[PDB]
């Protein structure tokens, strides 16, 4: 009886009551153009949109109805998209459905895997990925920033990495700024933010600043995220900066704050560093230079010797060179038996 269900029925989608998927009578483009010309030529042009979305929100109050609207439709006539993505394909509907998608998203913060083990808010943000047309880029950005601020930790971990799918190729600067400003506060979310910052289109001197910023706070990271961050740092070296970053890393990595609780994480970390030096030869040389040039500091750590034996056992050019260096550390009293 609502305008929404009537227009969808004459458009050619059978609305299921909410267990199995919604059926399709026509094709996707046919339905989209059908509803477009239907809403175009219909009288009362600037109010049928608000009536449509009011009927929509009143319909998707129910969990099953909304869950089926989010899930992909069924071809009766061989398998296509969801009603929400098809509806967001139409530019004149887009921002209203965006708004009523984000207004009801704080309803599903604490809702997690009730019946079908389908986590809802990831299904909500699924329908914004790879949009053909974006109207309101700034508004969409500010809305996801409000959500990414206010969200639970798991939800903001999820949506933050699905950012590059969502945004076009314009509005990346302020997004980078807000995410880095989130990074200085929250250290639990270091791993996906860095993941993303290379996966946007940022200026390189923003990335180097965030890299310096995370190496500054490298001690304040939980143990599980540590090999991932070191993986990021080592994967993001050039030929020119390598020694400064490696030497910061040599001076800042301790193994007296993380020591089946700590041993597994250290195993993983050494696996990362082994696999870095194996697949990239300049990190070995960089790292012998970072220990050999430490002459004054008779604060040599454990990390210096375990690194010397790993670069010995792997790439086997270094052997004469680590014999020489390690001789010159024992005469000098710098490395000792304890």
């Amino acid at each position: 009886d609502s305008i929404f269900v009537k227009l969808l029925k004459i458009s050619g989608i059978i609305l299921k009551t909410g267990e199995s998927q919604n059926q399709l009578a026509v094709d996707q483009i046919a339905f989209q153009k059908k509803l477009f010309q239907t809403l175009r030529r219909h009288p009362s042009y600037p109010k049928i949109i608000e009536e449509f979305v009011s009927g929509l929100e009143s319909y998707i109050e129910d969990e099953d109805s909304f869950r089926n609207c989010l899930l992909s439709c069924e071809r009766l006539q061989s398998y296509s998209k969801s009603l929400i993505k098809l509806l967001l394909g139409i530019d004149i509907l887009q921002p209203a459905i965006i708004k009523t998608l984000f207004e009801k998203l704080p309803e599903y913060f604490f809702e997690n895997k009730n019946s079908d083990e389908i986590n809802i808010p990831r299904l909500i943000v699924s329908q914004l990925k790879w949009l053909d047309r974006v109207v309101d880029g700034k508004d969409l950005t500010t809305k996801i920033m409000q959500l990414i601020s206010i969200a639970p930790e798991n939800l903001q971990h999820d949506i933050i990495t699905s950012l590059p799918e969502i945004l076009g190729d314009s509005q990346h600067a302020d997004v980078g700024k807000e995410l880095s400003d989130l990074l200085i506060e929250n250290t639990s979310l270091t791993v996906p933010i860095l993941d993303v910052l290379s996966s946007l289109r940022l200026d390189p001197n923003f990335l180097l600043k965030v890299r310096q910023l995370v190496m500054d706070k490298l001690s304040s990271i939980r143990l599980e995220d540590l090999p991932v961050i070191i993986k990021f740092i080592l994967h993001s070296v050039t030929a020119m900066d390598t020694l400064e970053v490696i030497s910061e890393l040599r001076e800042k990595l301790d193994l007296q704050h993380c020591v089946s609780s700590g041993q597994s994480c250290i195993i993983l970390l050494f696996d990362v560093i082994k696999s870095a030096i194996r697949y990239e030869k300049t990190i070995s040389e960089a790292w012998i230079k970072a220990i050999e040039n430490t002459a004054s500091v008779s604060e040599h750590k454990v990390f210096d010797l375990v690194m010397l034996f790993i670069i010995y056992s792997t790439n086997t050019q270094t052997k004469k060179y680590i014999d020489r260096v390690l001789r010159n550390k024992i005469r000098s009293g710098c490395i000792q038996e304890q």
Partner: protein, 607 residues
């Protein structure tokens, strides 16, 4: 000790005089491969030096000369002993797996400038043998997925092909490659996006499943949406997508509409859907210029080719709904108007001389190649439509006459400069399947329902010589690289069947109709059809010895041991040479004789 042995063995096999005298000695090759059998029990001391010998033989004797007998064949034979050592050592010694398979990878990833085919072969062999015994050494693979962005593309495709058998069985390794490809989808380098596209096409191409079986379908749809967005990037990524979409269809039928609309919408940016508008493709949008740097985007030719292949497959397979008829009538409108276009709709030959000095000549040259590709695709379409209608063959002739006018244009303009550009000898957009069928229908076919209609094609000699030229181009592509350019141009079995079919047809035209029927013109005596058929025969016989060595029985059976079949074929060829000789011709085409002794030199290695 291993390179010397193979020198010695080549001397004996090349000469009977030494075979009579020397009684058959065991060679170092067989001894090493005996050592490896013996080593299973307890000899672990010995096995860590077999691996080092393996990789010394492969690292030292592997190719470089492609990036002679003595520099090649006792180095080719050492490098394949190396790989045999490491594969046999890898099968039975369960502890030098994560040291061979991390040392093969560390050579594949990191060198990438020097040729590393030999390691990819070994890595394919290692996987193919038992990916069941590589789920105990898997993390060494998924650490090389993180280096995948920075590799050249051919290495990525080869290395992704080679691990396919690991991707069949392991779902963790598939879901570890997806995260890397998705992350490199957006990365700022160019080659990372190509490697993502490649990986995504190969995951769509080889797999259905990537837990409810709705999310697999929506995931395929989302991948296809990311690739649909990649369609608006640069030219090469578009071209990769257009080649890939056919193989994506032919495996996963369910993605039919998601592909075809993806092309049709992409066609409609460059198509004008009104009759009596004479350039029926918008060629301006296909070239972009930003301050005198001038480059291509959207090759229309490959797009239409992908459309026509997918559409033909849609007709022949899917129907035995009211969408494909639209694209049919679009293509028919393009043919109908491309016929009654002439040369000033694309401003060709009169106003611009396609000069490689200015931006405008660049634009016009790209335009000309695009129109040439379109005409070739529409030749293949118009052939494919009907059971040999006269009117459609007149349209084929008219399209070919347009293409041939453009070719003689481009040849005269490559006559002022040189033919240094390999862009007209750049591939034809005819499938090899189609050229086989076309030459079978041109020469051999004598069914009266087709004769009246084919007689307009046969009467065009330039068409038939173009057709055999195209078959020669496909065999030269098979020789130079491993495989050919078009559809089904990467499955060796399809190239084998089409090689057999070309052999049959060209033999029938060589032997049945002689050479001394030349009533055309004296420029065609080094370009005659019975000569080009023999040239194609020479290339086929070379290529089938090289690449299809294990099939020469079932190559010849399509034309009792191999000796009798080869003897009968030699009887044909040597009879040909005999009547060529005793004719006592003073002009004496020595080219045909050279090719005849070349094919006989090729054949006599099978007796």
């Amino acid at each position: 000790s291993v390179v010397k042995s193979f020198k010695d063995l080549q001397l004996l096999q090349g000469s009977k005089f030494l075979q009579n005298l020397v009684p058959h000695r065991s060679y170092v090759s067989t001894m090493i491969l005996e050592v490896v059998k013996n080593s299973v029990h307890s000899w672990d001391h010995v096995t860590q030096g077999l691996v080092e010998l393996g990789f010394i033989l492969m690292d030292s004797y592997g190719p470089k000369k492609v990036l002679p007998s003595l520099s090649r064949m006792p180095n080719q034979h050492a490098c394949k002993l190396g790989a045999n050592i490491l594969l046999e050592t890898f099968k039975i010694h369960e502890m030098i797996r994560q040291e061979i398979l991390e040392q093969v990878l560390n050579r594949v990833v990191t060198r990438a400038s020097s040729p590393i085919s030999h390691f990819l072969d070994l890595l394919s062999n290692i996987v193919m043998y038992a990916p069941l015994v590589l789920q105990n050494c898997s993390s060494k693979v998924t650490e090389a997925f993180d280096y995948l962005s920075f590799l050249p593309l051919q290495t990525v495709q080869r290395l992704l092909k080679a691990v396919q058998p690991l991707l069949k069985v392991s779902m963790s390794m598939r879901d570890c490659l997806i995260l890397v490809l998705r992350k490199a989808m957006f990365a700022n380098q160019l080659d990372a996006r190509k490697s993502a596209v490649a990986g995504f096409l190969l995951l769509l191409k080889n797999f259905k499943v990537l837990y409810n079986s709705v999310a697999n379908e929506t995931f395929c749809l989302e991948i296809m949406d990311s690739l649909r967005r990649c369609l608006s990037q640069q030219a090469d990524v578009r071209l990769m997508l257009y080649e890939g979409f056919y193989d994506v269809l032919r495996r996963n039928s369910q993605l039919a509409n998601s592909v075809m609309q993806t092309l049709l919408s992409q066609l409609k940016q460059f198509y004008e859907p009104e009759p009596d508008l004479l350039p029926p493709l918008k060629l301006e949008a296909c070239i972009l210029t930003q301050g005198d740097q001038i480059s291509l985007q959207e090759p229309l030719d490959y797009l239409l080719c992908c459309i026509q292949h997918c559409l033909a497959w849609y007709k022949n397979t899917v129907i035995p709904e009211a969408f494909y008829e639209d694209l049919d009538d679009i293509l028919e409108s393009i043919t109908n108007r491309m016929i009654k276009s002439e040369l000033e709709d694309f401003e060709l030959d009169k106003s611009a001389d396609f000069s490689q000095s200015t931006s405008i000549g660049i634009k016009n040259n790209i335009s000309a190649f695009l129109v040439m590709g379109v005409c070739e695709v529409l030749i293949e379409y118009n052939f494919s439509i009907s059971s040999f209608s006269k009117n459609r063959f007149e349209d084929i002739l008219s399209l070919f006459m347009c293409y041939k006018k453009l070719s003689d244009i481009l040849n005269e303009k490559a006559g002022k400069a040189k033919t240094k550009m390999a862009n007209k000898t750049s591939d034809s957009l005819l499938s090899m399947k189609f050229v086989s069928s076309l030459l079978t229908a041109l020469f051999r076919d004598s069914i009266q329902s087709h004769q009246e209609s084919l007689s307009v094609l046969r009467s065009s000699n330039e068409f038939m010589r173009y057709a055999v030229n195209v078959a020669l181009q496909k065999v030269q592509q098979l020789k130079e690289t491993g495989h050919v350019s078009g559809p089904d141009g990467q499955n060796p079995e399809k190239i084998f069947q089409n090689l057999c079919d070309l052999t049959r047809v060209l033999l029938w035209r060589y032997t049945s109709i002689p050479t001394s029927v030349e009533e055309s013109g004296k420029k065609e005596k080094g370009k005659s059809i019975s000569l080009l058929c023999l040239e194609g025969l020479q290339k086929i016989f070379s290529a089938v010895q090289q690449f299809y060595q294990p099939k020469i029985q079932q190559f010849l059976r399509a034309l009792v041991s191999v000796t009798q079949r080869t003897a009968f074929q030699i009887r044909q060829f040597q009879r040909s040479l005999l009547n060529l000789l005793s004719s006592q011709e003073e002009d004496f085409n020595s080219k045909e004789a050279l090719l005849l002794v070349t094919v006989l030199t090729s054949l006599s290695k099978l007796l």
